[PDB]
Design a protein around this ligand. Sequence first.
Ligand code: DBH
Ligand code: MN
Ligand code: MN
Length: 179
Amino acid sequence: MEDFVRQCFNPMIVELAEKAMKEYGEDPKIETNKFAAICTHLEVCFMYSDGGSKHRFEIIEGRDRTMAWTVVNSICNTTGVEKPKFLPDLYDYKENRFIEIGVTRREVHTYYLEKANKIKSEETHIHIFSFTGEEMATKADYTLDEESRARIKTRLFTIRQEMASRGLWDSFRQSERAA
Ligand SMILES: O=C(O)c1cccc(O)c1O
Ligand SMILES: [Mn+2]
Ligand SMILES: [Mn+2]
């Protein structure tokens, strides 16, 4: 699974996933499902940020925590928008809201609800993707056009097939359940 992650995602994503795990005391070589999952989440965040007009999104995910918070604070202080309790992934300059992006191996609505009650925000938009083509967003406002979301769904499905074809998919699907 480790080698699969390293040849499936680009070096930059891999490097950001390694950092993120080291910060939390996890080992990429041992917890290889969480490694893959983190790479996946990062990829989706970047595709998503790319999905609109070329400067629509402040990218929050992938940065160092302290700089992420600094950027978050600048947005709040300049837009008025309320300050999130947890680090979101993106800010949408067009719609004036932060976005939390989720990717689940379980049901979209389950994840959506866990994520919603964790953040406690009538402002932060939530957008969940699955490895089965499903998506759920706050007030069914999917932010992006169809094409951009579709591209993401396809990519996710390819990752699932690529894993499946190596027999790593079951272990990966179950592991989000074990957490
Ligand atoms: O920001 C995170 O750390 C995070 C952790 C787990 C799942 C996520 O979607 C995240 O954005
Ligand atoms: Mn995040
Ligand atoms: Mn997220």
